């Protein structure tokens, strides 16, 4: 079942209010045709060029940095064009995106939340209208609106009584969740 990692800096934090404001925060690094002309928007996977285990975003607006994890794949030109898709395992959200293929992979300096065992998997078929397109295509847009409708859906699969208006100590007193010491 999903689990979930937050600083104890969130503990009485909803999910979906975190989510809001980490959304906000992180903005929208413009990943637009036209607004793509080097590597400040576009990204990076690991190992790439066009697939990974990992794809990673720095915020262009602040330090903020996600890390989608699982099998994912980017179609670039082919049909359907641009989309991301494969099985999307893990979000982690923070400060600092830190690594390369060569230097053990990416991760965060100061990782705030992560979401484990997502268990996502969208075909290429169903192009930007797959699932896990969506969900990262939204994180960064600035729009977190599709991941937190997939952590409501799994949270009430572990127990309807859970949702993304839990704090993340409700969470963890459930289970699902897991404090962090903060830094």
Same mark, same amino acid.
């Given at each position: %079942?999903? %689990?979930?990692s937050y600083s104890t800096t969130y503990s009485g934090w909803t999910v979906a209010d975190y989510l809001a404001?980490?959304? *906000?925060?992180?903005? =929208?690094?413009?990943? #637009?045709p036209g607004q793509v002309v080097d590597g400040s928007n576009t990204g990076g996977f690991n190992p790439g060029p066009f697939d990974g285990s990992q794809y990673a975003l720095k915020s262009t607006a602040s330090d903020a940095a996600f890390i989608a994890g699982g099998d994912l794949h980017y179609t670039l030109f082919s049909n359907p064009s641009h989309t991301l898709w494969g099985k999307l395992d893990s979000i982690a959200l923070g400060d600092t995106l830190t690594g390369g293929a060569s230097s053990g992979g990416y991760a965060l300096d %100061? &990782?705030?939340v992560s979401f484990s065992n997502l268990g996502l998997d969208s075909?290429?078929? &169903?192009? #930007? !209208?797959?699932?896990v397109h969506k969900?990262?295509?939204g994180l960064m847009s600035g729009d977190s609106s599709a991941l937190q409708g997939q952590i =409501? *859906?799994?949270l009430k699969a572990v127990d309807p009584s859970l949702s993304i208006n839990?704090?993340? !100590? &409700?969470?963890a007193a459930a289970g699902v969740a897991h404090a962090t010491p903060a830094a």
């Open positions: %079942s999903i %689990s979930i404001d980490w959304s *906000a925060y992180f903005g =929208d690094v413009n990943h #637009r %100061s &990782q705030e075909p290429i078929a &169903q192009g #930007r !209208d797959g699932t969900v990262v295509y =409501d *859906a799994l839990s704090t993340f !100590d &409700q969470l």
